[PDB]
Every structure is written in structure tokens, then in C-alpha cells.
Design a protein around this ligand. Structure first.
Ligand SMILES: Nc1ncnc2c1ncn2[C@@H]1O[C@H](COP(=O)(O)OP(=O)(O)O)[C@@H](O)[C@H]1O
Ligand SMILES: [Mg+2]
Length: 240
């Protein structure tokens, strides 16, 4: 269980664009099994991984007596492959079924075309579902918009909670920016953060990136960071 400490509900700032997703996740984490499965989806850097692992962490702290599994569709891929090569499907099925109560799968757009894996995932799904094991899937695209995907799988995705994340507004971004800071224990002029929060509006991966970037600079350059400085430093985040 190598979940990321930062990815918790506590470090997740809520807002109009990610509230429902947030609650679905929290609700499911409080009642693993009551809503199987949860399918969160949204563009890049919008909270998918973070939300998904929070469910993980939250359950680890309240249900320590549970086998929580976080994985990547890709790893699910690479894991099967070896299973086929090394010739050990059992080792695999025991690992992704037998020994898991809750299974969290990130970025499932990696299985597009991979109908081989798609099929295996399909049953893994069904077996966990027939035993009340919570399933959570994250995708950068909605069930219906997943190209080259077995309808039977896609049908497994919609048969439960299906939340959507959308980019946050300036106000919410700023609060996220502030929360990102704490996590990194950094600090910034209540005018630089504002500038960053307002112009690094793609995804939250980059927003934090900038916030890290400066901090790394405020590191070397023993002195602070004035507005003008940050603007040159953050040139690949405003018009990348
Ligand atoms: N609602 C939020 N509140 C605070 N931080 C957030 C929020 N959403 C995303 N983040 C930050 O962005 C990062 C996660 O981006 P991520 O969820 O992995 O993008 P994606 O979902 O496309 O994989 C985390 O490190 C987290 O600090
Ligand atoms: Mg992700």
C-alpha cells in the first residue's frame, strides 16, 4: 500500500467544479460497498488521482483491517503481460481478486485498444462486484466516450456512481494554490500567489508545478521572489 500522503480529502479544496466528485469519493470511502462502483472522470490535472487515493488513505485509517489496492490501468496491463509470459495467471487473479477488498484503478484510458487486458479486467470487475468489493475507476474520458472499449466493460462503468470533475474558477484555484503551499511548507508574497493562481489556469498539476518551481528558486536565491521575477521564471506555465 504505497499511497501518497498528500492525496487525502483534507488536502482537497472543494468548489462548484469538483464538489460532487469530492462527495461521491468521501461517501464511497465511508461506506465501501454501498455504491459499486465509482467512476470518476475529468480532464488532466483536476483531482482524479488525488480523489482516488484519498478514498484509499481514508479507508486505511478507518478500516485498517482491510486490503486496499491502488493500481494503474497500465500496471494492470504490464502485470497481465508478465502473467502470460511467465505463465502465471493464478498469481495474478489471486492478487487482483482473492486478496483485495477495495480496488482503485487509475487512468483507465490506457486500456484503449488493449482489448486483451480489457477482457481480463472485465471479469476481475465482475468477481469483486459479486462479493461486495468496492471498485473505483478514474478516466480522463467518460464511459461513453472511451474509444475502442468493450461495451460490456463500459456498461460495468455506468452501473454505479459516475461523477465528473471540471476545472475550478479563479476563486477556488487560489484556495487550492494556498493549500498546495502548506503541503510544500513553502510561502509566497500574497501578491505572487495571486498572480500564479490567476494565470496558471490549465490544470492543477501545472499550477502546483509553478508553486514548486518558485519554491525551488526561493531555495537557491536565498532572498524572496518579487512579482516580476516569478513572471520570467513561470513562462512555460502561462503560454506553454
Ligand atoms: N480540489 C483540490 N484541492 C487541492 N488540491 C488539489 C485539488 N485537485 C487537485 N489538487 C492538486 O493537484 C494534484 C493532483 O492533480 P491530479 O489529481 O493527479 O490530476 P489528474 O486527476 O488529471 O491525475 C495534487 O498533488 C493536488 O495537490
Ligand atoms: Mg491521473
Amino acid at each position: 500500500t504505497p499511497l501518497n500522503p498528500d492525496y487525502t480529502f483534507e488536502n482537497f479544496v472543494v468548489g462548484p467544479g469538483n464538489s460532487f466528485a469530492y462527495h461521491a469519493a468521501l461517501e464511497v470511502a465511508k461506506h465501501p460497498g454501498r455504491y459499486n462502483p465509482l467512476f470518476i472522470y475529468g480532464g488532466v490535472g483536476l483531482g482524479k488521482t488525488h480523489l482516488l487515493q484519498s478514498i484509499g488513505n481514508y479507508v486505511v485509517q478507518n478500516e485498517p483491517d482491510l486490503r486496499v489496492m491502488y493500481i494503474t490501468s497500465e500496471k494492470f496491463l504490464n502485470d497481465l503481460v508478465d502473467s502470460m509470459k511467465e505463465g502465471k495467471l493464478n498469481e495474478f487473479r489471486e492478487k487482483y481478486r482473492k486478496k483485495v477488498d477495495i480496488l482503485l484503478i487509475d487512468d483507465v484510458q490506457f486500456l484503449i485498444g488493449k482489448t486483451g487486458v480489457q477482457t481480463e479486467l472485465f471479469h476481475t470487475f465482475n468477481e469483486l462486484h459479486d462479493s461486495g468489493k468496492q471498485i473505483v475507476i478514474c478516466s480522463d474520458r467518460e464511459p461513453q466516450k472511451l474509444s475502442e472499449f468493450q461495451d460490456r466493460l463500459v456498461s460495468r462503468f455506468q452501473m454505479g456512481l459516475v461523477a465528473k470533475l471540471e476545472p475550478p474558477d479563479e476563486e477556488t484555484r487560489k484556495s487550492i494554490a494556498r493549500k498546495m503551499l502548506e503541503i510544500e511548507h513553502g510561502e509566497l508574497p500574497e501578491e505572487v500567489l495571486n498572480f500564479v493562481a490567476e494565470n496558471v489556469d490549465d490544470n492543477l498539476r501545472r499550477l502546483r508545478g509553478a508553486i514548486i518551481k518558485l519554491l525551488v528558486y526561493k531555495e537557491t536565491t536565498g532572498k524572496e521572489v518579487d512579482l516580476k521575477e516569478a513572471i520570467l521564471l513561470l513562462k512555460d506555465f502561462i503560454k506553454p
